[PDB]
Design a protein around this nucleic acid. Structure first.
Lengths: 141, 76, 129, 246, 129, 72
RNA sequence: ACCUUGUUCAGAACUUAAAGAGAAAUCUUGAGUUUAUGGACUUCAGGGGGAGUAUGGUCACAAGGCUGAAACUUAAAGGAAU
RNA sequence: AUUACUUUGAAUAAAAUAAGGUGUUUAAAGCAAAACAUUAUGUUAAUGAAUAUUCAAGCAUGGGACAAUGC
RNA sequence: AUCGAGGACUACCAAGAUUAUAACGGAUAACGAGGAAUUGGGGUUCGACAUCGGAGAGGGAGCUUUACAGAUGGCUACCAC
């Protein structure tokens, strides 16, 4: 929890120190691991001061090799007017994943939501995750 | 027709109108790999590739069906 | 392989009618093929049919009466908006009074004149003169 | 551009001013104030075209600077003052008290009023916030920050304002039994009755408004403007009575 | 001047960015003013929109606060003993947020960690561990 | 005869096809069904399926107006 | 078992057509079911030369193979049949 | 359980396109004006096209046949 | 540091990020859109230029003033006139 040069403390820290956890908006239940958990994260949507604004997307988790941050691949179809046919496409989105989802792994469908720019590319935040099958390499966050 | 050759055989078992491992057997691949002594046999060196391409298709399916363990891989 | 069962059945029916045969046989019978015939039966283009069950998606026997000219499937079922109808009618049908399109909409498998009445679009299955 | 703009090209002007495309190169940019750029009619356009008192801008500055216009209770001397919604306009010299309401043709209309009914004007609350020192206040659609309000004056109600006094006379809540005038898009300038408001947590609040003739048309909550209570109008509606003919 | 736009960085794919326009004042940066330990000296920088930033160049005193006893008292800072980011800040005794500074508890009669932005607000304010 | 429910679209044993197949076999013990044919025909601008359980070598429980007969 | 006959499955083929297709020769176990044009997929062609040439890349010990233009030139070059 | 598909909207700069009206001597044009009060008065608070759209996305909603993604 | 998020910058730690659904690079006689020409349908070509958005003032760079300029019918230096 405290394995760094500076003291790791929550953005909203108070005595009774307490554990602070707000809840995000349109019907996303806060996970249990973020209530009793002792992790510290200033970018977690539940236990920090990052909102969840308009845009909301979904995709398949592909890469879980960066610290508390994952890559979400969205597959869709693009329509070409001349041929009246579709074509497969994809766009990778780098999204933050708080330690509240310990069981998240590569290949699991995840619902993500917009927040303020947290990095050069990271602008979305993980909201909920549904697990899927195994592929011989269980790579967790 | 057949998977590889252009033959078209329609022989089939016929279940009546009344309701009242294969991957292992395909490892044939061992038997041909005989090839250690008949090094010049360019036929059996081709029918082995056909057998091995079949195995890579049954493994590719038994993994998706979650039957075989995810670490399976056929080798000598 | 048999990518489209509907294509195989319609091409079998068209060939029989050219030869003047009295009835035809369709080996793999689906619900979509059965429902496509009802559109042709409601217009009296075919007399009737008989789905014989064989425990293996059984066959169909179709009675024809000298009326069908050509029934053809359309390769991948294009999404047809209601504003795209008369563009499709002006291509696939001989005249404004004769032909009949077939669309698989959310309200079943309808023709053009009753999908227009029902005010819906959908993927296009085929047509028959 | 390195800063705020000052000119307005004729074709970039809002469509609901009906400016001739060959009239001239520029259009009168409305100065800032109570009403937005696209929600207001500049005072020059009210007199040159709607009332035809002044032929050109030479004779518009000769009027507004002559203390001959009283926008609301106060008197304005800005040639391009933003004259928006039902904020009353009065000319004591000619003894006429107009008012800028909408109508079904997506256009600002000058509804004539009498002297008595020109002393008041309806406002729509936009938001209510608690000031420092616990001094609550509300903001109307005119940008007015009214002082210590009624406790029940919530975000999306309608209040009655007095020009001479400045107090709040009567207030109308936002419910399913009220008459509303439209300030929006397709439904712009239509009177009706609120019957249903379906809520989507994400983006917008959608309100179904039933017309007098049984016509039902939906809209966004932003464009709704309550005009009365119990199928009653507090002001004289325009000539077409807020009715739309298909 | 120092710039803060992203037009000079590589893409997420590693591809170089091809410039289109010159530098602009919106993304203007400014030189750091490492507030060392010494006599009082601040400078008023005229930022954007006319607002004024107090740029503390050197400071000696700060209004430290004690959380337990609910008391805030002025004190003279002694020596910067720890910086979580750069150990070279300790050598030069540069005062930045989060720097652990030891102070004399002369008015405390009645170890510290800074919690203000001396280079922005213009003074040192902290608390007692 | 058995008593199984039909869900609203539960497993394949709780589908309409399986229930009617089970009811047909359980109500017909020990005589065997060995053929089924449906003769669609247009009547009054409507299609009227006429299911026929053939080779017999129900409406109340299931609802299918099925005629039972013997092979020709 | 070998031969004679009936059914049926698979393979290399053959004969007739007043029918289907096509420019025709001809094709029919398609080159048919195509302006009444859509079963799925892959490769290839765009007047004749220049030319499978020049340059770039790569493979080979080599001969050479594979990928592969342009400038310019010209009203034909060609297919089947009488 | 989502997506895709389809139907309604919401929202959506003008000019331009199609377009409604209007005798610039007609027409291109312009969004002006006039049948008329034979006109100060009233028609008149006159017309301003609903102006329709607009592809690829985005929001909501009615439907689940044809399709896609795992349990 | 900034008006402000942010590797925007600095210190420490990890090895990560994109790619056959075409990444990276090359060409443009490439400013983008509303739109224009021609069209049975499908389309092809064009758009510096009415209007909207971007960029520039011979070439870079650096700054002052003010609410907004990295201004150039403002200033400083170098390059070229």
């Amino acid at each position: 929890e405290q394995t760094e040069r500076a003291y790791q403390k929550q953005v909203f820290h108070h005595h009774s120190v307490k554990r602070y956890h707000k809840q995000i908006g349109m019907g996303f239940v806060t996970p249990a691991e973020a209530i009793k958990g002792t992790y510290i994260d200033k970018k977690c949507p539940f236990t920090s001061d990052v909102s969840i604004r308009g845009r909301t997307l979904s995709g398949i988790v592909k890469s879980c090799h960066m610290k508390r941050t994952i890559i979400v691949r969205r597959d869709y179809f693009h329509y070409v007017s001349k041929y009246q046919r579709y074509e497969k496409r994809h766009k990778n989105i780098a999204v933050h994943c708080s330690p509240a989802f310990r069981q998240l792994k590569e290949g699991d469908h995840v619902v993500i939501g917009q927040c303020r720019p947290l990095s050069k590319t990271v602008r979305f935040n993980v909201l909920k995750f549904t697990s899927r099958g195994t592929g011989d390499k269980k790579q967790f966050a | 027709g057949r998977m590889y050759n252009p033959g078209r055989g329609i022989s089939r078992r016929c279940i009546p109108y009344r309701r009242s491992e294969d991957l292992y057997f395909l490892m044939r691949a061992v038997s041909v790999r005989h090839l250690e002594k008949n090094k010049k046999d360019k036929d059996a060196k081709y029918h082995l590739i056909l057998i091995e391409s079949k195995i890579h298709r049954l493994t590719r399916y038994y993994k998706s069906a979650k039957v075989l363990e995810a670490s399976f891989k056929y080798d000598a | 392989v048999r990518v489209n069962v509907l294509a195989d059945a319609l091409k079998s029916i068209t060939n029989a009618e050219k030869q003047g045969k009295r009835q035809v046989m369709i080996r793999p019978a689906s619900k979509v093929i059965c429902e496509f015939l009802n559109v042709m039966m409601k217009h009296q283009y075919i007399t009737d049919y008989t789905v014989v069950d064989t425990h293996r998606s059984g066959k169909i026997v179709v009675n024809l009466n000298g009326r069908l000219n050509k029934c053809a499937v359309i390769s991948p079922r294009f999404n047809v908006t209601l504003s795209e109808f008369d563009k499709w009618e002006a291509n696939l049908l001989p005249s404004r009074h004769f032909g009949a399109l077939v669309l698989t909409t959310s309200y079943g498998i309808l023709d053009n004149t009753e999908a227009r009445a029902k005010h819906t679009g959908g993927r296009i299955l085929g047509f028959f003169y | 551009a390195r800063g705020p703009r000052h000119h307005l090209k004729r074709l970039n002007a809002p469509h609901h001013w009906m400016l001739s495309k060959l009239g001239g190169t520029f259009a009168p940019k409305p100065s800032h104030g109570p009403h937005g750029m696209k929600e207001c009619l500049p005072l020059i356009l009210i007199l040159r075209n709607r009332l035809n008192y002044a032929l050109n801008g030479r004779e518009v500055t000769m009027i507004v600077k002559n203390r001959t216009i009283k926008i609301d209770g106060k008197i304005r001397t800005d040639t391009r003052y933003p004259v928006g919604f039902m904020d009353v306009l009065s000319i004591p010299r000619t003894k006429e008290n107009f008012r800028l309401m909408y109508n079904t043709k997506r256009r600002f209309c000058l509804v004539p009023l009498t002297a008595e009914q020109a002393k008041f004007k309806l406002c729509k609350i936009e938001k209510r916030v608690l000031g420092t020192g616990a001094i609550p206040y509300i903001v109307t659609h005119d940008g007015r920050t009214i002082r210590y309000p009624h406790p029940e004056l919530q975000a999306n109600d309608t209040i009655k304002l007095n020009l001479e006094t400045g107090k709040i006379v009567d207030f109308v809540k936002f419910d399913i039994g009220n008459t509303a005038m439209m300030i929006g898009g397709n439904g712009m300038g239509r009177v009706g009755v609120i019957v249903k408001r379906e809520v989507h947590p994400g983006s917008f609040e959608i309100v179904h408004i039933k017309d007098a003739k049984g016509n039902t048309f939906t809209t966004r909550l932003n464009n709704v403007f309550v005009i009365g209570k119990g199928t009653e109008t507090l002001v004289n509606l325009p000539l077409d009575k807020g009715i739309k003919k298909p | 001047g120092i710039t803060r736009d992203s037009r000079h960085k590589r893409r997420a794919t590693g591809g170089k960015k091809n410039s289109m326009q010159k530098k602009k004042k919106n993304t203007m940066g400014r030189q750091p003013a490492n507030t060392r330990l010494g006599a009082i000296r601040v400078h008023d920088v005229r930022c954007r929109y006319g607002i004024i930033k107090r740029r503390a160049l050197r400071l000696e005193n700060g209004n430290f606060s004690w959380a337990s006893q609910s008391i805030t008292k002025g004190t003279k800072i002694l020596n910067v003993v720890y910086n979580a980011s750069d150990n070279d800040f300790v050598r030069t005794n540069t005062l930045v947020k989060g720097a652990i500074i030891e102070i004399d508890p002369a008015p405390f009669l009645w170890l510290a960690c800074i919690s203000s932005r001396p280079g922005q607000t213009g003074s040192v304010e902290g608390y007692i561990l | 005869i058995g008593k199984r429910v039909v869900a609203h679209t539960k497993p394949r044993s709780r589908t309409s096809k399986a229930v009617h197949e089970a009811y047909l076999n359980e109500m017909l013990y020990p005589v065997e069904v060995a053929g089924q044919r449906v003769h669609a025909t247009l009547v009054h601008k409507k299609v009227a399926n006429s299911k026929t359980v053939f080779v017999a070598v129900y409406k109340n429980i299931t609802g299918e107006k099925v005629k039972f007969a013997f092979p020709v």
